[PDB]
Design an enzyme around this catalytic site. Sequence first.
Site, PDB file in Angstrom:
ATOM      1  N   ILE A  13       0.802  -1.221   0.000  1.00 48.82           N
ATOM      2  CA  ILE A  13       0.000   0.000   0.000  1.00 48.82           C
ATOM      3  C   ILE A  13       0.842   1.282   0.000  1.00 48.82           C
ATOM      4  O   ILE A  13       0.341   2.360  -0.326  1.00 48.82           O
ATOM      5  CB  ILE A  13      -1.144  -0.023   1.070  1.00 48.82           C
ATOM      6  N   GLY A  14       2.125   1.145   0.334  1.00 44.88           N
ATOM      7  CA  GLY A  14       3.069   2.260   0.261  1.00 44.88           C
ATOM      8  C   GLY A  14       4.399   2.011   0.952  1.00 44.88           C
ATOM      9  O   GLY A  14       4.751   0.869   1.269  1.00 44.88           O
ATOM     10  N   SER A  15       5.141   3.093   1.172  1.00 43.68           N
ATOM     11  CA  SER A  15       6.407   3.049   1.896  1.00 43.68           C
ATOM     12  C   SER A  15       6.509   4.225   2.847  1.00 43.68           C
ATOM     13  O   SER A  15       6.058   5.329   2.531  1.00 43.68           O
ATOM     14  CB  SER A  15       7.592   3.077   0.931  1.00 43.68           C
ATOM     15  N   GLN A  17       9.014   5.639   6.617  1.00 46.39           N
ATOM     16  CA  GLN A  17      10.352   5.795   7.190  1.00 46.39           C
ATOM     17  C   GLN A  17      11.154   4.496   7.261  1.00 46.39           C
ATOM     18  O   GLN A  17      12.361   4.498   7.014  1.00 46.39           O
ATOM     19  CB  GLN A  17      10.261   6.419   8.587  1.00 46.39           C
ATOM     20  N   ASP A 126       8.159  13.641  16.575  1.00 40.38           N
ATOM     21  CA  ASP A 126       7.876  13.987  15.176  1.00 40.38           C
ATOM     22  C   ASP A 126       6.370  14.090  14.923  1.00 40.38           C
ATOM     23  O   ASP A 126       5.831  13.441  14.018  1.00 40.38           O
ATOM     24  CB  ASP A 126       8.527  12.973  14.226  1.00 40.38           C
TER      25      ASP A 126
HETATM   26  C1  LIG Z   1       2.973   7.504   9.375  1.00 37.67           C
HETATM   27  O1  LIG Z   1       3.444   6.324   8.719  1.00 37.67           O
HETATM   28  C2  LIG Z   1       2.760   5.166   8.933  1.00 37.67           C
HETATM   29  C3  LIG Z   1       2.230   4.893  10.190  1.00 37.67           C
HETATM   30  C4  LIG Z   1       1.527   3.726  10.421  1.00 37.67           C
HETATM   31  C5  LIG Z   1       0.970   3.473  11.796  1.00 37.67           C
HETATM   32  C6  LIG Z   1       1.355   2.797   9.392  1.00 37.67           C
HETATM   33  S1  LIG Z   1       0.458   1.302   9.687  1.00 37.67           S
HETATM   34  C7  LIG Z   1      -1.044   1.640   8.850  1.00 37.67           C
HETATM   35  C8  LIG Z   1      -2.292   1.541   9.335  1.00 37.67           C
HETATM   36  N1  LIG Z   1      -3.254   1.846   8.481  1.00 37.67           N
HETATM   37  C9  LIG Z   1      -2.890   2.222   7.294  1.00 37.67           C
HETATM   38  N2  LIG Z   1      -3.746   2.544   6.251  1.00 37.67           N
HETATM   39  C10 LIG Z   1      -3.298   2.936   5.034  1.00 37.67           C
HETATM   40  O2  LIG Z   1      -2.103   3.042   4.811  1.00 37.67           O
HETATM   41  C11 LIG Z   1      -4.260   3.197   3.939  1.00 37.67           C
HETATM   42  C12 LIG Z   1      -3.847   3.829   2.758  1.00 37.67           C
HETATM   43  C13 LIG Z   1      -4.751   4.040   1.734  1.00 37.67           C
HETATM   44  C14 LIG Z   1      -6.064   3.610   1.863  1.00 37.67           C
HETATM   45  C15 LIG Z   1      -7.054   3.827   0.743  1.00 37.67           C
HETATM   46  N3  LIG Z   1      -6.868   2.883  -0.389  1.00 37.67           N
HETATM   47  C16 LIG Z   1      -6.569   1.478  -0.020  1.00 37.67           C
HETATM   48  C17 LIG Z   1      -7.870   0.669   0.136  1.00 37.67           C
HETATM   49  C18 LIG Z   1      -5.546   0.820  -0.982  1.00 37.67           C
HETATM   50  C19 LIG Z   1      -4.179   1.473  -0.771  1.00 37.67           C
HETATM   51  C20 LIG Z   1      -5.410  -0.679  -0.689  1.00 37.67           C
HETATM   52  C21 LIG Z   1      -5.904   0.984  -2.463  1.00 37.67           C
HETATM   53  C22 LIG Z   1      -6.478   2.969   3.022  1.00 37.67           C
HETATM   54  C23 LIG Z   1      -5.581   2.753   4.053  1.00 37.67           C
HETATM   55  S2  LIG Z   1      -1.137   2.163   7.178  1.00 37.67           S
HETATM   56  C24 LIG Z   1       1.887   3.051   8.132  1.00 37.67           C
HETATM   57  C25 LIG Z   1       2.591   4.245   7.885  1.00 37.67           C
HETATM   58  C26 LIG Z   1       3.174   4.526   6.550  1.00 37.67           C
HETATM   59  O3  LIG Z   1       4.358   4.301   6.384  1.00 37.67           O
HETATM   60  N4  LIG Z   1       2.451   5.013   5.516  1.00 37.67           N
HETATM   61  C27 LIG Z   1       1.016   5.317   5.664  1.00 37.67           C
HETATM   62  C28 LIG Z   1       0.188   4.857   4.462  1.00 37.67           C
HETATM   63  N5  LIG Z   1       0.905   4.967   3.173  1.00 37.67           N
HETATM   64  C29 LIG Z   1       0.241   5.392   2.063  1.00 37.67           C
HETATM   65  C30 LIG Z   1       0.928   5.504   0.721  1.00 37.67           C
HETATM   66  O4  LIG Z   1      -0.932   5.701   2.134  1.00 37.67           O
HETATM   67  C31 LIG Z   1       2.327   4.572   3.110  1.00 37.67           C
HETATM   68  C32 LIG Z   1       3.108   5.279   4.224  1.00 37.67           C
END
Ligand SMILES: COc1cc(C)c(Sc2cnc(NC(=O)c3ccc(CN[C@@H](C)C(C)(C)C)cc3)s2)cc1C(=O)N1CCN(C(C)=O)CC1
EC number: 2.7.10.2
Length: 259
Positions: A13-15, A17, A126
Amino acid sequence: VIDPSELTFVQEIGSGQFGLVHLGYWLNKDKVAIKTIREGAMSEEDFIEEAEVMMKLSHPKLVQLYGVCLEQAPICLVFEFMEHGCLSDYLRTQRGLFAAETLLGMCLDVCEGMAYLEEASVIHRDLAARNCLVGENQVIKVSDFGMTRFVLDDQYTSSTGTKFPVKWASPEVFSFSRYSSKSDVWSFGVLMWEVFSEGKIPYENRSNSEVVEDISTGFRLYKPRLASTHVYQIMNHCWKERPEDRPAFSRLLRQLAAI
Ligand SMILES: COc1cc(C)c(Sc2cnc(NC(=O)c3ccc(CN[C@@H](C)C(C)(C)C)cc3)s2)cc1C(=O)N1CCN(C(C)=O)CC1
């Protein structure tokens, strides 16, 4: 400890830190977000120490770390899945759709999370919109508190580093690396600005050095349209030069709830 077999990696879903983030499933039922920690990114053994306490920190306005998958290289962190991703992205995507009250509600959410951390003697280090996530019914949760302690990239961690988050840093942080809950308060003020600005980048994307100069001389962010006179004075109190002149999160919570 989460067993590797208890996790299913579904899609990247992404990248961030520390590297890759995947949508995954925990015991083939529950949606989770899995951080895969890249080589050279983390101070690994030092984090595995602090993981136990971090997990013990629990609050409805903090993104819950459900567990750590240690029985593999690279190690994984398993998080509560936040359906709308990062607040920074969410604000920009939904720009134009927000009522002032909703935006205030977001600040309240973050402040509740931070009040808990402050109470628990935990400095975020941060705090910014990019480090907050959006969940069910636009609830905001704070994430990755204290994680920059484990970052190996000296460009992020050192106040002099090229990747240092100067834009959210209190004067005593960017000059002397003097962290406290009151330096998180400065950051919170900038986060309020981000929220009420609907995801604008603070300080016209000015250089690190120019921001240091701006703040050192007394410059402060101007009021966003959607922020009331009252909200703006709360923001300015967060940006007092001396940390001792800034309110605690416990005080800010009383103020934001009173609105
Ligand atoms: C502050 O940094 C973070 C902190 C936590 C604590 C989490 S753990 C997480 C818990 N929940 C999360 N949810 C998501 O990251 C999310 C992103 C997009 C969508 C909407 N579209 C979905 C349905 C997809 C991407 C599957 C098409 C829904 C959820 S990540 C992940 C990251 C992180 O590294 N990223 C956040 C999400 N990212 C992007 C590009 O969006 C990548 C960088």
